[PDB]
């Protein structure tokens, strides 16, 4: 139910940095980020329309760590919801609890955040939530519980997050180790490299 | 006001009884054309008042025979 393989392998295949490493060390130093994985990496075949759409979808899925059935469900939900479908999909993905934890900074990677969430380190509105796919809502406080409050990983992660670019849609208290999910982000608020439109076309073939 | 149907008398041979076509001008389910559909009814008529070709108004009633559950109420356009 989770991808347990090499992460820079995934990043190399996509082309971009998927943030599968903490970002202490540069990805160029950890791998040949430019060259694609495998014997035939040093080759860029001309990509079909289907291929480009698939690659974009794969990129997004890898970024968040969602397998296909769940991703498809997300897309359907987005389509059902009013407004722009790609935008809705992005919002839902962002809404995921592991993602919010990562954004707040209670984990260097989403993999780390997911681990914490699974292992019951994270309380949503003072109630231990265990599901990584848990949709966080606006005005939801999300906090590290004290047993995980002593974790050196958590404090290190916070430091790394401080280095990273802070999200506008959250407000996080580093000493309290609690963050309030004020609102679901807008498309202008999320990253521009993601071409949600390709994904919409692919799941609307 | 009572429920009643009009129709042309298709036959009047069986005694005290007439057969009354009740053509309805329905629309076709699929093609949308309007088709003339027909409804034969055995109607009871006492006194054998009705002729063939006669327009006749009928109402529904308790069954009077195997096939006969309608009675006539008034004849109209009873020309020959």
């Amino acid at each position: 139910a989770r991808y347990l393989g090499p992460k820079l392998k995934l990043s190399r295949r996509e082309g971009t940095d998927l943030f599968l490493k903490s970002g202490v060390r540069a990805i160029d130093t950890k791998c040949k980020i430019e060259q694609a994985p495998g014997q035939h990496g040093a080759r860029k075949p001309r990509l079909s329309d289907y291929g480009v759409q698939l690659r974009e979808k794969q990129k997004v899925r890898r970024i968040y760590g969602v397998l296909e059935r769940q991703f498809r469900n997300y897309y359907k939900e987005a389509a059902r919801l009013k407004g722009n479908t790609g935008e809705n999909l992005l919002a839902l993905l962002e809404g995921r609890l592991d993602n919010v934890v990562y954004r707040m900074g209670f984990g260097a990677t989403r993999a780390e955040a997911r681990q914490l969430v699974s292992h019951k380190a994270i309380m949503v509105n003072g109630r231990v939530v265990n599901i990584a796919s848990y949709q966080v809502s606006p005005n939801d406080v999300v906090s590290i519980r004290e047993k995980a409050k002593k974790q050196s990983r958590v404090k290190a992660a916070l430091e790394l997050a401080e280095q990273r670019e802070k999200p506008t849609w959250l407000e996080v208290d580093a000493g309290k180790m609690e963050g309030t999910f004020k609102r679901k982000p807008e498309r202008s608020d999320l990253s521009a490299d993601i071409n949600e439109h390709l994904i919409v076309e692919l799941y609307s073939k | 006001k009572i429920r009643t149907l009009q129709g042309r008398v298709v036959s009047d041979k069986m005694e005290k009884s007439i057969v009354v076509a009740i053509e309805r001008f329905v629309k076709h389910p699929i093609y949308g054309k309007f088709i003339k559909r027909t409804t034969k009814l055995h109607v009871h008529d006492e006194n054998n008042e009705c002729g063939i070709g006669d327009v006749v108004e009928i109402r529904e009633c308790r069954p009077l025979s195997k096939t006969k559950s309608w009675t006539l109420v008034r004849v109209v356009e009873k020309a020959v």
Partner: protein, 122 residues
């Protein structure tokens, strides 16, 4: 075409026959090998293709391909047949299932094992 014509005589749906009628809308069916032989392919191919004429549980006498390299089949050998034609044996509409009742899994296969009934090697 004329609306009147359609009303008179409506449009007939094109009743498509099945191409695997011995299955009788079953996903597989059991049968007994009446006869096991090799046959020549069609004009763009040369081979000796392994095939068995099989009497099915429901009466039908069909012909069935035997895929994979080598097989432990002979007369009176109970097998499961599945849908699929050999495009190049004329009139063969069914495959044997490798890895079923009397049919053995293919020997020494490491790929497509699920398709050839071979258990995972250590």
């Amino acid at each position: 075409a004329t609306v009147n014509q359609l009303v008179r005589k409506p449009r007939a749906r094109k009743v498509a026959k099945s191409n695997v009628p011995a299955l009788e809308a079953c996903p597989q069916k059991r049968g007994v090998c009446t006869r096991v032989y090799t046959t020549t392919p069609k004009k763009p191919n040369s081979a000796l293709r392994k095939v068995c004429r099989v009497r099915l549980t429901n009466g039908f006498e069909v012909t069935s391909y035997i895929g994979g390299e080598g097989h432990n089949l002979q007369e009176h050998s109970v097998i499961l047949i599945r849908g699929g034609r050999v495009k190049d044996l004329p009139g063969v509409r069914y495959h044997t299932v490798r890895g079923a009742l009397d049919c053995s899994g293919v020997k020494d296969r490491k790929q497509a094992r699920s398709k050839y009934g071979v258990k995972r090697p250590k």
